[PDB]
């Protein structure tokens, strides 16, 4: 019947372990494991009571589980459903319910390990542009919220090692949609662009979702080479289920044109894109520099928990 708060009472550790090939270590890279302390007291929580944990700047959980239980010695005290932020919200959450149990307990406390990745940008969507300012390279405090209470720990987030001068690409699985977002940022022209053509063509096995496309110019890029703004400029979009192409005219100095689209793949863990990549800098000659990338999925992990019950 009631909402309780403060069930998640500590943020114990935040540790990265590689779950994908190729990608540098950074906030978005699968997988970060957050270990949190949790406690339930039967004097202050009844079966059916609900509680929620908010995870700011978290894109998704790196698990196919729909829920995780808060357990101690193989008894389930509560069930928490995963609610990924993805492109809907800037934060993720757990919506939890206290479970009925077959024998009484006085109180129980333990820890829970949650596989997550953080959102620090990746498209021109409102969510990603907001989250592009979530963290900076180096030392950051990561804070989650349970009601009005805050639980935090420190972490070192590495910047992308890829030079911001060249083109930037990124592919991100959006699990609840069985789709990816795929980004292309044009190489830098320091004093602006006269024109260019940006986009990609999908090989058999994947298609472009023309209903979820963002085109913009960003005022620089962040520590992970992602757009931080999306302003308008003169362009023509040509989008088909096989290809997206954007031809554009002048872009000012300090801005970076980019395009992103959703991709539906028959095999979400493998698709190929051939990128157009044409640009003409102001006071420069036209560069034509197509390339191809085959994008490989990451491995999922499971959330789990442990704890100790006091009986009385």
């Amino acid at each position: 019947r009631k909402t309780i708060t403060g069930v998640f009472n500590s943020f114990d550790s935040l540790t990265w372990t590689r779950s994908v090939e190729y990608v540098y270590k950074g906030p978005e890279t699968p997988t970060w494991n957050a270990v949190l302390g949790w406690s339930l007291n039967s004097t202050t929580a009844d079966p059916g009571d609900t509680f929620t944990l908010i995870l700011p700047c978290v894109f998704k959980f790196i698990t196919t589980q729909t829920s995780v239980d808060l357990t101690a010695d193989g008894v389930s005290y509560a069930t928490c459903d995963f609610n990924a932020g993805e492109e809907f919200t800037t934060f993720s959450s757990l919506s939890c319910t206290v479970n009925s149990v077959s024998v009484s307990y006085a109180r129980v406390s333990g820890t829970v390990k949650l596989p997550i990745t953080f959102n620090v940008g990746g498209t021109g969507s409102s969510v990603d542009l907001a989250d592009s300012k979530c963290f900076t390279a180096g030392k950051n405090t990561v804070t989650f919220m349970d009601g009005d209470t805050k639980i935090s720990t420190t972490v070192d987030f590495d910047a992308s090692p890829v030079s911001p001068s060249g083109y930037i690409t990124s592919s991100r699985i959006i699990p609840s949609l069985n789709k990816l977002s795929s980004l292309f940022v044009v190489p830098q022209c320091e004093n602006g662009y006269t024109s260019g053509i940006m986009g990609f063509v999908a090989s058999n096995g994947a298609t472009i979702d023309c209903s979820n496309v963002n085109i913009g110019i960003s005022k620089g890029l962040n520590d992970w080479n992602f757009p931080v703004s999306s302003e308008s400029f003169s362009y023509t979009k040509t989008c088909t289920s096989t290809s997206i192409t954007v031809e554009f005219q002048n872009v000012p100095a300090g801005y970076r044109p980019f395009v992103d689209a959703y991709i539906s793949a028959e095999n979400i863990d493998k698709y190929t894109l051939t990128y157009a990549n044409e640009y003409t800098c102001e006071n420069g000659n036209t560069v034509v520099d197509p390339f191809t990338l085959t994008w490989w999925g990451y491995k999922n992990s499971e959330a789990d928990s442990d704890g100790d019950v006091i009986v009385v």
Partner: peptide, 7 residues
């Protein structure tokens, strides 16, 4: 021509 990973 090159391999890359998803996030």
């Amino acid at each position: 021509a090159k391999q890359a990973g998803d996030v």
